[PDB]
Amino acid sequence: SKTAQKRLLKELQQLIKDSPPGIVAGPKSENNIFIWDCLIQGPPDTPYADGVFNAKLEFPKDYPLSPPKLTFTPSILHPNIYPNGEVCISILHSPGDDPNMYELAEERWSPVQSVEKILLSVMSMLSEPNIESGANIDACILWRDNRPEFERQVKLSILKSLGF
């Protein structure tokens, strides 16, 4: 918990100076560093391009051993996002039982991963859904089968949210 704090401080300090394009994240209080707020803008050529989404990132006491919990406050339409708003991707997961297999490397969560690696994963996620870690059934069979409707659907909500 005190080790997790020394850790979160560097990543935070590092992010603020070399902040990834289209993303701003950080805590509200100088003391509660275990809860961050995010503002992720949809990447360029994705049906999200125009939208801007709010997300909450919650870190456990044993960070970086255990991953944080990313959750888009107002849940959006995506096969890798549960209806409650919780983001499900392999980077936010434990290696498993036999972490030595050639796969894991990049994909699973381990102390070699940064929060930036996560935000970066979230970005390509909005561009490239990973059906292996599908968290929303409908969003999955919609994106898979009738994609034009999916992109139509996702773009309607972005419009609506703009006070339209």
Side-chain angles (χ1 to χ4, degrees):
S1 172
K2 185 68 259 286
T3 157
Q5 204 218 216
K6 313 298 292 176
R7 169 78 188 233
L8 288 177
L9 246 317
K10 310 150 187 173
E11 294 201 69
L12 182 51
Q13 199 241 87
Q14 272 182 183
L15 274 193
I16 290 156
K17 309 314 176 304
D18 188 59
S19 204
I23 310 174
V24 57
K28 336 180 93 312
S29 178
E30 195 218 10
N31 290 317
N32 197 17
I33 197 184
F34 284 42
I35 311 183
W36 296 18
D37 269 341
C38 308
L39 277 177
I40 301 162
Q41 299 165 49
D45 309 296
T46 69
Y48 300 96
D50 311 316
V52 174
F53 330 97
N54 262 102
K56 187 207 310 165
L57 192 49
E58 301 158 84
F59 305 83
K61 300 297 162 292
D62 66 304
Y63 183 78
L65 291 203
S66 285
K69 174 182 168 153
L70 183 57
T71 155
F72 283 68
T73 47
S75 183
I76 66 180
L77 204 257
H78 201 286
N80 296 94
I81 291 176
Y82 293 92
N84 64 103
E86 195 177 331
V87 177
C88 180
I89 37 178
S90 49
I91 193 72
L92 259 32
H93 284 271
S94 158
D97 332 276
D98 199 327
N100 298 13
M101 310 196 313
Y102 184 75
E103 292 96 327
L104 138 140
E106 67 291 337
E107 37 202 308
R108 301 298 162 98
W109 179 269
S110 60
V112 293
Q113 311 287 165
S114 63
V115 293
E116 184 195 37
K117 289 300 170 196
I118 299 178
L119 278 356
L120 267 35
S121 300
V122 187
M123 283 311 259
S124 58
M125 178 204 77
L126 291 168
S127 181
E128 292 286 56
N130 207 107
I131 242 183
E132 313 205 319
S133 45
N136 188 346
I137 187 57
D138 324 276
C140 252
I141 60 172
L142 186 54
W143 175 78
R144 182 179 66 185
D145 305 346
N146 196 355
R147 187 188 303 175
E149 195 45 44
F150 170 86
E151 295 187 350
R152 176 179 176 261
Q153 211 69 22
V154 169
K155 301 205 68 169
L156 281 192
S157 47
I158 288 184
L159 262 33
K160 299 191 184 178
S161 61
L162 301 194
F164 285 150

